[PDB]
Amino acid sequence: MAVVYVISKSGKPLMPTTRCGHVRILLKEGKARVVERKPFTIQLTYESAEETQPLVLGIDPGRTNIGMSVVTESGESVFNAQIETRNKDVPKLMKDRKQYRMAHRRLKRRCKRRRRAKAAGTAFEEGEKQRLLPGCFKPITCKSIRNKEARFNNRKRPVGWLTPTANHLLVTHLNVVKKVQKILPVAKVVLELNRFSFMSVLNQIIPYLADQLADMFPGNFCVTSGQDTYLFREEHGIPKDHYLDAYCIACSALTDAKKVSSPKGRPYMVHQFRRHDRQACHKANLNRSYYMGGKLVATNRHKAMDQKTDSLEEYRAAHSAADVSKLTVKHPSAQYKDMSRIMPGSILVSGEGKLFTLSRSEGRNKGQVNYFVSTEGIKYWARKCQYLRNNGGLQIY
RNA sequence: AAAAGAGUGAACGAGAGGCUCUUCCAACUUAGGUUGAAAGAGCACAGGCUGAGACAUUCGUAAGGCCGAAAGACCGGACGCACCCUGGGAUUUCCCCAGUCCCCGGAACUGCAUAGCGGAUGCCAGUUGAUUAUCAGAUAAGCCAGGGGGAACAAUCACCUCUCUGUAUCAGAGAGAGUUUUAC
DNA sequence: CCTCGACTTCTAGTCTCGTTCACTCTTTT
DNA sequence: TACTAGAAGTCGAGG
């Protein structure tokens, strides 16, 4: 039934075994040492022959659901994994990063320089200047001082430059392949190619993935077509599911596969957690709330950009000066994240002794986290949980 | 080859708002306090690096075409610059990267000319300590900062069978040679 | 019948406009 | 979007 992955005494991956009673005997007798809780990996502690058969790794690429499966020369299944990529979050984070950077440079540098210039008298006499910059046909308005030099004419990128999102997706594919290599002795690699007319990040990265996979597996790299996968499915009767695709892909490179049958059993699930979080501010509240008694009646002095609720100006329009004189203002202070916190993806044990993978930290009182939420959605009192293992980028669930 | 279609990276510039303080005018309330209007000044992740580099006025910025009496304008693109290129560095770390920026040079490539750079003038800092000299300190209108991966770090016993308990499902605890080799 | 620890439930987080530039892939014709 | 900080709420313990 189950499959136990085996590693040689030298750290070399070996053929997985399914005897599962020899495994327990070996573990009790001390000849085998557990390497990974899930997928269950054991390393032999004694030298032995390392005969291996060829294995084929089939990849169904995607932006948020990568699928891979390892098969023997006859179409038997020994590994099936489905990875939920963190890719969608990267462009939004990068956009927010750009906005924060522009805010920094506008408010801490440009506005301060303009303020100093007005103070010192070293400003334009007109106070405003229209500047026609090379490469532009319409001027920019510079108030009280020259602009910092604008650089857009001749910025060059190395050939085959990839955006952080596409690079992240490519690196994710390669990293998950490396993790599979740590477990099994992969011999051949098959990739399913995708072309999108749109009349996408994955479409951008497919050729680079093919190149670098070919480098990783010299002479042992094949490519298949989506139509080929569909025909294989129809011919061999594999049930139509998303995670089965990879298996079918892996079965294309087999010359004569007599034991083709759909894998039975849920595949391993892999979650991607960010390695770094450089942000220091949680909430910069920035909303001057006006309460009359205990009811919110206004949100700013004058309505801000993209604000729909009434501000103080409307309230002054509607009510009287004796009403305004009684208002109370409440502006909460900015909140900062703990940057040394236990990041999501960490592995901890609860007070009752159950092991879990951290998903989020919920609540905070007196400078200490209230609840740790596991990847299964169970809340544990953080004071009693014990920290075992730091975040690895790709984590089995 | 171009045409479009889908994405997602970079520089610079304007605001609506926000925080602190001052002046002044109202309103409400135990000269004081709270709220607001108007005018003004300062301030913009937590932080890392650095000691000067920001701004204003003005002068200079190739040869050769070409229009002008001339002054000068236009084209062009170097002996001028650079976002380009070789090398080094800050952000920078447990190991790396992206992005931005800086320094000395400039073979080819790429780009700029109302830009950028250099000079002159003006304006905006900080000066203390240990042994006039050296190290350290202070010194912003300086640069970067909300992006990504990997390593290492388990109280890491999985599956199946039996027993107990809770529990509708099922889960927790204990025990176990379950074909022989993890690969024939 | 209060008060105070120890948890438990629940909510909320900044936006816009300009001047330009760049890279990767796909498809047609 | 969603992880994370923090305000308000609930419940016993105890005197």
Question: DSSP characters for A101-149?
Answer: HHHHIIIIIIHHHHHHHHHHT-S-SSSEEEE--TT-SS-EEEESSPPPP
* Distance, Å, A48 CA → B175 C1': 31
* Cα dihedral across residues A138, A141, A146, A150: positive or negative: negative
Closest residue, by C-alpha, to the C1' of B14: A141
- Residues 277-306 in A having a C-beta less than 7 A from any atom of strand D are 277, 282
Please report, for residues A2, A66, A236, A318, the alpha-carbon distance to residue A89 in angstroms, rounded to integers and kept in the order given: 35, 16, 38, 44
Q: Is the CB of A370 under 7 A from strand C?
A: yes
Method: cryo-EM
The token duo for A51 is 């005969």
Nearest to A249, CA basis, from A39, A64, A84, A77: A77
Task: State how far the Cα of A64 lies from the Cα of A366, in Å rounded to an integer.
Answer: 38
Chain centroid offset of residue A373 CA: 18
Strands laid side by side in the A268-272 sheet? A221-225, A188-193, A55-60, A66-72, A77-84, A268-272, A394-396
- Both tokens of A71, joined, read 């098969």
- Give the closest nucleotide to A112 (alpha carbon vs C1'): B141
CA A122, chain centre distance (Å): 49
C1' of B143 to CA of A141 (Å): 25
Nearest protein residue to nucleotide B161 (CA to C1' distance) is A21
Structure token pair of residue A288: 């001057």
Q: How far apart are CA A227 and CA A303, in angstroms?
A: 57
CA distances from A12 to A7, A49, A104, A172, A297 (A): 6, 11, 51, 23, 69
Angle, vertex CA A80, rays to CA A74 and CA A83, nearest 5:
150
Read off the DSSP letter of residue A196: -
Q: How many CA atoms lie within 13 A of A159 on its CB side?
A: 0
Quote the CA–CA distance of A364 and A343 in Å, as a whole number.
15
CA atoms within 13 A on the CB side of A109: 9
Question: Of all nucleotides in the shown strands, which has a C1' nearest the CA of A361?
Answer: D4
CA–C1' gap, A265 and B154, in angstroms: 27
* Residue A2 Cβ under 7 A from any strand C atom: no
Helix/strand/coil for A302: coil
Distance A258 CA to B149 C1' (A): 40
A296 CB closer than 7 A to any strand C atom: no
* Angle of helix A164-183 versus helix A201-216 axis, rounded to 10: 40
Helices (H), ranges, chain A: 22-29, 89-104, 111-120, 164-183, 201-216, 226-236, 244-250, 312-318, 321-324
Start-to-end CA span in chain A (Å): 20
Distance CA A51 to C1' B175 in A: 35
Question: What is the C-alpha to C-alpha distance for residues A16 and A7, in angstroms, rounded to an integer?
Answer: 8
Report the alpha-carbon distance of residue A190 to residue A90 in Å, rounded: 28
Q: Is A81 left (phi over 0), alpha (psi -120 to 50) or beta?
A: beta
Q: Which residue is nearest to nucleotide B153 (CA to C1')?
A: A389
Report the C-alpha gap between A272 and A179 in whole angstroms. 13
Can you tell me the distance from the alpha carbon of A316 to that of A325, in angstroms, rounded to the nearest whole number?
A: 10
